[PDB]
Amino acid sequence: RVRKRQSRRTSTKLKEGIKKKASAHRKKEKKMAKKKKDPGIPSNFPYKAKILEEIE
């Protein structure tokens, strides 16, 4: 005896409300927003000992 299954149909009211939720959260995050280290010469690169030589 297998049980129910949720539906994936989106019922337009929900996608309108989600758009509004996100449009509000974006403003709130923009408002809270008001309050490099270069990773180097990575290994496994075989010809890495040549980049050390263009310096001088």
Binding site: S43, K48, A49, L52
Partner: peptide, 19 residues
């Protein structure tokens, strides 16, 4: 020297790290 290849690349790794 199947192992010696790896041995040489480890040493050159060490050289690069030192520099």
């Amino acid at each position: 020297t199947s192992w010696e290849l790896k041995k040489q690349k480890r040493l050159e790794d060490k050289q690069f790290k030192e520099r």
